[PDB]
Amino acid sequence: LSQDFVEALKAVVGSPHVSTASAVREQHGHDESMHRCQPPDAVVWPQNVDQVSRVASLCYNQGVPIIPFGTGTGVEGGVCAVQGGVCINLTHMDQITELNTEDFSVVVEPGVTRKALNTHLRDSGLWFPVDPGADASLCGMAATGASGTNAVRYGTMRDNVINLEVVLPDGRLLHTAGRGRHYRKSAAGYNLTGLFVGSEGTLGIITSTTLRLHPAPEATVAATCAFPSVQAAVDSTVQILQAAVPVARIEFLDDVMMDACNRHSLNCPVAPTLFLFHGSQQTLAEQLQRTEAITQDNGGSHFSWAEKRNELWAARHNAWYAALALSPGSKAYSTDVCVPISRLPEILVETKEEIKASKLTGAIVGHVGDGNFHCILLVDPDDAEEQRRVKAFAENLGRRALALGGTCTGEHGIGLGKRQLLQEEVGPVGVETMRQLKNTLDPRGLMNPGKVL
Ligand SMILES: Cc1cc2nc3c(=O)[nH]c(=O)nc-3n(C[C@H](O)[C@H](O)[C@H](O)COP(=O)(O)OP(=O)(O)OC[C@H]3O[C@@H](n4cnc5c(N)ncnc54)[C@H](O)[C@@H]3O)c2cc1C
């Protein structure tokens, strides 16, 4: 990057908010995945949306790539600057606005994390349910199309994003559903909000998100349930969903994951396990009765039932790091397939068998209520042959999911790792259509290049 360009950036955001230092760039050249660090040429922290617009227009017209950066917790290399350019760290815009408790909505800027929002909402009787394990930027979660353990009942980001404020690549400001609007449903024109959810920073920069809030549940019960086999755990899950029990969370851990989480955080029996209800005192008893009946018929243990619940779900949210702690110094790559629920037993049991018959260390954890799971595969950062084997494993598993009518990623996204799988998933006309949308919004191809498509 030229000296005149760097001075132009500083003129927009202020000297302290532009850095070309190698260490600062290296910290912004990678996320939590195994993808190799590729540092941007500069990092910029805009202080308001006018500055985001002016930074984007400066980069765009000079032919400099733009990489939006939230909290850097992605796992597909979305923030790696494969073509250099300017990394725009958005987290100094960190204000919550327009809290409308009577309408169940709130507007947040990119520096707001889910934990910050729910802290702000204490005493309101409302909460925001979409809960990825990491304390990520909510706007970053909109950009990746994230979900979480609560999504089986309360929906994903796609279900809970009502509106987005987006700086387009050339700096124009778009409010996808209209400035200041919030409502339950609309048929007005084409739905632009859904286009930018899951766009991973390749179509523009999300500078605020309007979120749907939910009422806090009247009563909560959490429990764990140990099974004799992966088959028995996943059959129970499928049967619970087919019985229409409105479980609030239903998370699967294989025995490897359960032992890893025990060691990193618990003392649950080392076995394929379900972490599991919201409603009134009496509603819970019915849900529990129907769910315990199904789990018992598949060999589940009696359920192992305001501090131990928090510790239970904190251990699940840290499963990624529990897995990494199995082999210190290693990095991780995760699969993320989502299949029609009736096919979940076959593919989960097959994955377990394939991990066991392999030399790789893999732990399985997942949002199985959605038909979704992660195979977290560990890699030695220097063992290039192990790295080729994890990639081959992840690609085989993704193709098996596609063969079953599913998708190669339920929530993490495509980034750098799944671009060939996406082409297989949607086919030539799907790829061309996505590319035409990318081209009309980002003609010069400068909005996070090398990702998704
Ligand atoms: C321990 C752990 C657990 C996780 N659990 C889950 C889980 O349960 N579910 C799940 O879905 N994910 C999960 N993730 C992945 C990650 O937390 C999510 O993908 C999250 O949405 C990433 O947000 P971020 O701001 O940290 O993203 P970053 O890594 O900063 O960016 C991710 C991508 O989005 C783009 N981007 C970021 N912010 C914006 C913006 N404001 N506008 C436009 N583009 C933007 C970036 O360019 C990049 O391509 C987990 C990650 C970790 C480390």
Numbering used by the authors: 27 to 291, 293 to 303, 305 to 333, 337 to 484
What does the original paper state about this entry?
Mammalian lactate dehydrogenase D (LDHD) catalyzes the oxidation of D-lactate to pyruvate. We demonstrate that mLDHD is an Mn2+-dependent general dehydrogenase which exhibits catalytic activity for D-lactate and other D-2-hydroxyacids containing hydrophobic moieties, but no activity for their L-isomers or D-2-hydroxyacids containing hydrophilic moieties. Similar to other members of the VAO/PCMH flavoprotein family, mLDHD consists of an FAD-binding domain, a substrate-binding domain and a C-terminal domain. The substrate-binding site contains a positively charged pocket to bind the common glycolate moiety and a hydrophobic pocket with some elasticity to bind the varied hydrophobic moieties of substrates.
To elucidate the molecular basis for the substrate preference and catalytic reaction of mLDHD, we determined the crystal structure of wild-type (WT) mLDHD in FAD-bound form (mLDHDFAD, 1.70 Å resolution) and in complex with FAD, Mn2+, and D-lactate (mLDHDFAD+Mn+D-LAC, 1.73 Å resolution). There is a non-covalently bound FAD at the active site, which is apparently derived from the expression system, indicating that FAD binds to mLDHD tightly. In the WT mLDHDFAD and mLDHDH405AFAD structures, there is no density for metal ion and ligand at the active site. Later structure determination of mLDHD in FAD-bound form confirms that there is no metal ion bound at the active site (see discussion later). In the mLDHDFAD structure, the substrate-binding site is occupied by a water molecule. Comparison of the mLDHDFAD and mLDHDFAD+Mn+D-LAC structures shows that the binding of Mn2+ and D-lactate causes only very subtle conformational changes of a few residues composing subsite A including His398, His405, and Glu442, which rotate their side chains slightly to better coordinate Mn2+. Comparison of the mLDHDFAD and mLDHDH405AFAD structures reveals no notable conformational differences at the active site.
